[PDB]
């Protein structure tokens, strides 16, 4: 009686970032991933009869450690039957939905928190700091002019962000803009909203919100956004007052995010003697590293 | 057999609460179902070696029992050929629609009646009480000045219920709002809430006129909102004058209602020599329970 | 010979009500159809065995008889050949178009005349009274001021009709609006009311000028619309002054109307010895009935 | 060897000027390519009355010599595994990309440098002087009308360039315009100048922003655009302050630029005893020549 499919199948069905981030697995026993940053690999053309310049440049190697473990614990009493269907099916779906929500929430936490990433001088040539463009939209607006004013401001902010991120040599084909529900409702232009090509693959065919082709790139409404408080993955993922206002984020598929899965989903059943219950728990090991912070475009909206 | 298929097919297509509640079935001879009030638990993190916070289990078991049988009595006369395909199929559609209507009516009655659970007196930190937010809308003589006041009042009550229910840790996406016919008509008379939501999610699954994307969640026009003081399911579903004033329900699609069917749609025809008729009837056994009444916000329109 | 085929294929192509009403046939050589309205309620809930369910005797039925025969008389002189001089076919389309015009005219006649319907004999709560809407459109003079004022009146009348129908539990999926030519022409001069969801730029499968989406339902312009005060079907279809003013009708394609054809299109050649003109005539027996006058909206425009 | 394949394919995928300039190759040991600037062999008439004019006037012949080697010296430490496919493929992608921007940058720098080319002696009839167009763009005004003024000036400059190319017998179809990122961003502010290019989402086989067929020809946004500085190819490509202001170019895709590859992409590995690193570098020899500098027109935006 393995319900892991119920947890797993919805996880692929709901986790947006299964194709929007690089999927990696730690092979060593230690839960640490060594990934290169590629500080500089510029072209040298001194080979023209003059002595070549032997000056090298090093590349930093960022380290991500998989410390926190995320789990769901379910106390199932002795008289209650867990191997029975329906109850097992619905409970696994809830666990999978919660896990996918936390996955997306952690990824958004990384993206918005990586907006003030001052690039070190050791790697400035081929890198840049993150961009934190702001916007001023009046959410509590009912007049027709006020509704248009918010939409044009949002469009201007998105245009400035996409232009800036284009200047950093990122192709337009691999581009996604994620917006909050309120921002998605606020924007009015819907230029031939996409269905399933936002990320391509298979995942969940035309399940997510309509991907309006705003400014030539898909815009997807992600409900899993940070409001406040902390995050289960650790204190490093705590939402601040300023980080809560950042909703619309633009980034790249393959050069903005990397995820390491130290241990996949594992479901365990262990009898409890002190308390009469066959408690059921499922856990997983993963950590998200936000590689290349220069390829992220977040917008910090202001009410008034 | 053809008549039974016609009833079932129409019932599946029209019952808007068939996907808005958990469908369960009693397997034992005892026609009662024991269901746990709590659905699932949140994610936690051990964070390597750190003293785990022990959270005691705070659950509740709900016993829902089917009591009454729901049936339609169709007095077919002797001369009329009851086995006529034109008559049989047409007969099945109407009483199947009536079954769908009473099904939705019973679910909405449970949702309204569970507007004040005042907690089980020993689970306050986990389960809260009901929601009875109020709104005074001058429906009579809307004209062109008071119509704005009614629309904004409905909108503010709606988003107040939304934020209050989000405060109880419920995802925004899994929220569905149902309104009465007059409430929906008043909402569509909005002179300032213009939204381009008529196209997307026009029907809430098969036909329902849904004003989707209202404050981030769909708002579905429901014609099953009652005004009388009786219901076929028994005295437990009777409606008071105050309960009739309630005309709008906001709740969750996975942890707010449970439906159990003791007996499926069984149809039979028997000869009735007393009334000189060949009567045909179909009956079913089901009962609806309101699991977690704390995840449903109901606003009462006092009008005046 | 081949004249029957020509007059037939044109009839289906032009008569829009072949799909807008139930097709019936008196297969008993009795020239009468015994079709019964449906008034079965959901009075159920046997509950305890001690309590007993009352026996209902609520029965009702209607009968429609094909009184008159619809025929077209075509005098053909002796000199003019008609066996197949590419001429009987040409007369075929004209006769078929006239038959379709009379068919649609009779359907609109019944729809308009059933707008009051008073109340049924037993005053069934399920069967409400017919719907009549009073409107005032200044079609006489439109000095760039009443052109948009009249369009507002048409839109609010259509909204009142759609709201009243929705209150009476008719799905939005199956509901069509037929409008007179002059009102339709007045409608397109102010085309922001239309949803611009044309796509096919046609009717609901027909070939008439139709705003395929207006207020959620198609609005088709029917050229064959009651204007005179006499109809071939008999005195039951005569038009009063008030009945002619009603220019727009809303109903459902599956419940509002039923048509029955006692005898199909029959064409015979008659050699009229007198007048020296052998004639060819086509006749057909049919009659229409408004099964559900409650599920129909009729709006009357009263000058300015 | 896998790194060689990955580096080559990315260069083909990204290098814009592969199809925008004829690809030649030196076969002789000496790394010089002979390019003939053929003169105008005009038509003459052998009229019987007059005598011929035997004047075999010669033409001018240009010589292009390559004397610079470009490479990517990538230092790899001993502990790291250079043969790991995950790490090796990322080497190929980045190196191929960087080669692509260097190649396009060299082509653009020589195109800009050719704007001051003066036709030599004995070649005035066929060959003409290079085309340079002045334009005043504010690049700072945000008064709507002021934003349009810059777009209008850019449109006039582009039209003048098109006229100059047409007057010199250059077909319209074989003509491409490349613009800087800021100029392209300025153009999208006013979409009136742009033309509908839904069919051609990406132009010139370039996934970069080029969905604008302005004045009947594509206008691609070239990210790899030169600025004030130097180039690895040599001192001949040192962009001056004045040359950095030329943000727009317009040229033919078949008779404006010639590139010759003396050495293909060859990669070797040095076991560098010094620094305890295994430096990996791929090097190639190529040179670009501006045949027919009279088929390229540039716009030197200045002031504000």
Beta bridge partners of B221: B179
- Determine contact, residues A301/A183, Cβ cutoff 8 Å: yes
DSSP state of D77: B
Q: Please name the chains neighbouring C, where neighbouring means 3+ C-beta pairs under 8 angstroms.
A: B
In residues, how long is chain C? Answer: 304
In degrees and rounded to multiples of 5, residue A139 shows phi and psi of -65, -40
How many CB atoms lie under 10 A from the CB of residue D209?
A: 27
User: In the structure encoding, which two tokens stand for residue A198, read together?
Assistant: 């936002």
Please give, one letter per residue, the 3-state secondary structure of C236-282: HHCCCHHHHHEEEEEECCCCCCEEEEEEEEEEEEEEECHHHEEEEEE
B98 touches chain C (CB under 8 A): yes
Question: What is the structure's resolution, reported in angstroms to one decimal?
Answer: 3.5
Alpha-carbon separation of residue C55 from B67, B74, B75, C84 (angstroms)? 21, 11, 10, 66
Q: Measured in Å, how far apart are chain D's first and last C-alpha atoms?
A: 52
How many Cα atoms sit within 13 Å of A73 on the Cβ side? 17
User: In the structure encoding, which two tokens stand for residue C22, read together?
Assistant: 């139930």
How many Cα atoms sit within 13 Å of D200 on the Cβ side? 18
Contacts of C40 in chain B (CB under 8 A): 72-74, 94-95, 98
Give CA–CA dist A131/A164, Å, rounded: 9
User: In the structure encoding, which two tokens stand for residue D204, read together?
Assistant: 């010139």
Please give, one letter per residue, the 3-state secondary structure of D187-238: HCCCCCCCCCCCCCCCCCCCCCCCCCCHHHCCEEECCCCCCCCCECCEHHHC
Give CA–CA dist D126/C239, Å, rounded: 88
- Determine contact, residues B219/B177, Cβ cutoff 8 Å: yes
DSSP line for B158-212: HHHHHHHHHTTS--STTEEEEE-HHHHHHHHT-SS---S-SSTT-BSSSS-BEEE
Residues contacting B196, CB < 8 A, separation 6+: A188, A190
Distance of CA A51 to the CA centre of its chain: 47
- Determine contact, residues B59/A83, Cβ cutoff 8 Å: no
Among the listed residues A254, A302, A304, A20, the one whose alpha carbon sits nearest the alpha carbon of residue A133 = A302
D94 touches chain A (CB under 8 A): yes
Q: Angle at the Cα of C165 (from C161 to C168), degrees rounded to 5?
A: 150
Give CA–CA dist A283/A68, Å, rounded: 11
- Determine contact, residues A160/A250, Cβ cutoff 8 Å: no
- Determine contact, residues C32/C63, Cβ cutoff 8 Å: yes
Q: Please name the chains neighbouring D, where neighbouring means 3+ C-beta pairs under 8 angstroms.
A: A
**Residues D257/D263/D268/D270 CA torsion (nearest 10 deg):** -90
Q: Which of residues 232-261 of B touch C (CB under 8 A)?
A: 232-234
A47 touches chain D (CB under 8 A): yes
Q: Please name the chains neighbouring A, where neighbouring means 3+ C-beta pairs under 8 angstroms.
A: B, D
Subunit contact B43:A67, Cβ cutoff 8 A = no
Burial (0-12, 13-18, 19+ Cβ within 10 Å), A37? middle
Subunit contact A41:D87, Cβ cutoff 8 A = no
Among the listed residues A39, A130, A67, the one whose alpha carbon sits nearest the alpha carbon of residue A260 = A67
Give CA–CA dist D212/D106, Å, rounded: 25
Question: Is chain C in touch with chain B: ≥3 Cβ pairs within 8 A?
Answer: yes
Pairing relationship of beta strands A134-136 and A296-302 according to DSSP bridges? parallel
Render the burial of B59-69: b for 16+ CB within 10 Å, e for the rest. Answer: eeeeebebbbb
Pairing relationship of beta strands B296-301 and B134-135 according to DSSP bridges? parallel
Subunit contact C57:B70, Cβ cutoff 8 A = no
- Determine contact, residues D287/D65, Cβ cutoff 8 Å: yes
Q: Where are the beta strands (DSSP E) in chain C?
A: 22-24, 32-35, 62-65, 70-75, 131-135, 176-179, 210-214, 217-221, 246-251, 258-272, 277-289, 296-301
Question: Is chain C in touch with chain D: ≥3 Cβ pairs within 8 A?
Answer: no
Subunit contact A41:D74, Cβ cutoff 8 A = yes
Residues contacting D77, CB < 8 A, separation 6+: D276, D277, D278
- Determine contact, residues D278/D294, Cβ cutoff 8 Å: no
Burial (0-12, 13-18, 19+ Cβ within 10 Å), D283? middle
- Determine contact, residues B19/B104, Cβ cutoff 8 Å: no
Give CA–CA dist D228/D244, Å, rounded: 6
How many CB atoms lie under 10 A from the CB of residue C273?
A: 8
Distance of CA B270 to the CA centre of its chain: 34
In degrees and rounded to multiples of 5, residue D258 shows phi and psi of -130, 135
Mutate to test the interface with D, among A42, A43, A125 (most CBs of D within 10 A): A43
Q: Where are the beta strands (DSSP E) in chain D?
A: 22-24, 32-37, 60-65, 69-71, 131-136, 176-179, 219-221, 246-251, 258-269, 280-289, 296-302
Based on C-alpha coordinates, what's the Rg of chain B? Answer: 22
Burial (0-12, 13-18, 19+ Cβ within 10 Å), D4? middle
Please give, one letter per residue, the 3-state secondary structure of chain A: CCCHHHHHHHHHHHCHHHCCCEEECCCCCCCEEEEECCCCCCCEEEECCCCCCCCCCCCCEEEEECCCEEEEEECCECCCCCCCCCHHHHHHHHHHHHHHHHHHHHHHHHHHHCCCCCCCCCCCCCCCCCECCEEECCCCCCCHHHHHHHHHHHHHHHHHHHHHHHHCCCCCCCCEEEECHHHHHHCCCCCCCECCCCCCCCCCCCCCCCEEEECCEEEEECCCCCCCCCECCEHHHCCCHHHHHEEEEEECCCCCCEEEEEEEEEEEECCECCCCECCEEEEEEEEEECCCHHHEEEEEEECC
**Which residue is listed with tokens 């010759």?**
D260
- Determine contact, residues C189/C208, Cβ cutoff 8 Å: no
How many Cα atoms sit within 13 Å of D296 on the Cβ side? 30
Question: Is chain B in touch with chain D: ≥3 Cβ pairs within 8 A?
Answer: no
Burial (0-12, 13-18, 19+ Cβ within 10 Å), C18? middle
Q: Angle at the Cα of A184 (from A180 to A185), degrees rounded to 5?
A: 120
Q: How far does the CA of residue D202 sit from the closest CA of chain A (Å)?
A: 10
Give CA–CA dist A137/A301, Å, rounded: 6
Contacts of A222 in chain B (CB under 8 A): none
SS3 B269: strand
Among the listed residues A182, A286, A282, A281, the one whose alpha carbon sits nearest the alpha carbon of residue A237 = A286
Give CA–CA dist A41/D72, Å, rounded: 6
- Determine contact, residues A169/D16, Cβ cutoff 8 Å: no
Pairing relationship of beta strands C217-221 and C277-289 according to DSSP bridges? unpaired
* H or E element that contains D104: helix D85-113
Beta bridge partners of C105: none
Structure-solving method: cryo-EM
Residues contacting A121, CB < 8 A, separation 6+: none
In degrees and rounded to multiples of 5, residue C238 shows phi and psi of -65, 155
DSSP state of C37: -
Beta bridge partners of B131: B297
| C59 vs B75, B97, B203: nearest CB | B75
Subunit contact A72:B171, Cβ cutoff 8 A = no
C38 touches chain B (CB under 8 A): yes
**Which residue is listed with tokens 């509740």?**
B60
D275 touches chain A (CB under 8 A): yes
DSSP state of C130: P
- Determine contact, residues D300/D111, Cβ cutoff 8 Å: no
Give CA–CA dist B198/C196, Å, rounded: 12
Residues contacting A196, CB < 8 A, separation 6+: A205, A206
Give CA–CA dist D303/D135, Å, rounded: 9
Burial (0-12, 13-18, 19+ Cβ within 10 Å), B119? middle
* H or E element that contains B261: strand B258-272
DSSP line for B16-82: TTSSSSEEEE--SSS-EEEEES------EE--SS--PPP------EEEEE----EEEEE--BSSS-T
Contacts of A127 in chain D (CB under 8 A): none
User: In the structure encoding, which two tokens stand for residue D237, read together?
Assistant: 């490509």
Give CA–CA dist C242/C112, Å, rounded: 10
Q: How far does the CA of residue A242 sit from the closest CA of chain D (Å)?
A: 28
Kindly identify which residue of chain A lies nearest to residue B39, measuring between CA atoms: A91
């Amino acid at each position: 009686e393995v319900y892991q499919n119920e947890v797993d199948t919805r996880f692929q069905y709901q986790a947006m970032f299964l194709g929007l981030s690089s999927q990696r697995s730690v092979a060593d026993r230690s839960n640490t991933y060594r990934i290169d940053r590629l500080n500089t690999s510029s072209v040298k053309g001194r080979t023209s009869g003059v002595a070549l310049e032997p000056t090298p440049v090093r590349n930093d190697k960022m380290l991500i450690v998989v410390d926190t473990v995320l789990y769901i614990r379910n106390p199932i009493d002795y008289q209650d039957d867990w191997t029975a269907p329906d109850f097992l099916t619905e409970m696994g779906q809830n666990n999978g939905s919660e896990f996918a929500e936390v996955f997306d929430q952690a990824h958004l936490i990384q993206l918005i928190k990586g907006r003030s990433w001052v690039a070190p001088a050791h790697l400035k040539p081929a890198f840049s700091d993150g961009i934190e463009i702001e916007a001023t939209i009046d959410s509590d607006v009912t007049t027709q002019a006020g509704m248009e004013a918010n939409a044009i401001a949002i469009n201007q902010a998105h245009k400035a962000g996409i232009d800036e991120l284009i200047k950093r040599k990122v192709p337009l084909n691999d581009m996604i803009t994620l917006v909050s529900t309120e921002i998605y409702s606020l924007l009015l232009e819907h230029p031939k909203l996409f269905n399933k090509d936002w990320g391509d693959a298979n995942a969940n065919g035309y399940k997510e919100r309509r991907a309006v082709l705003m400014n030539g790139i898909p815009v997807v409404e992600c409900t899993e956004f940070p409001d406040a408080g902390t995050h289960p993955l650790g204190s490093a993922y705590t939402v601040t007052a300023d980080d809560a206002k950042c909703r619309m984020v633009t980034f790249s598929k393959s050069r903005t995010l990397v995820t390491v899965e130290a241990k996949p989903f594992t479901s365990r059943i262990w009898d409890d003697e002190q308390n009469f219950a066959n408690v059921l728990d499922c856990y997983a090991m993963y950590q998200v590293g936000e590689r290349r912070p220069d390829t992220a475009a977040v917008v910090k909206f202001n009410e008034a």
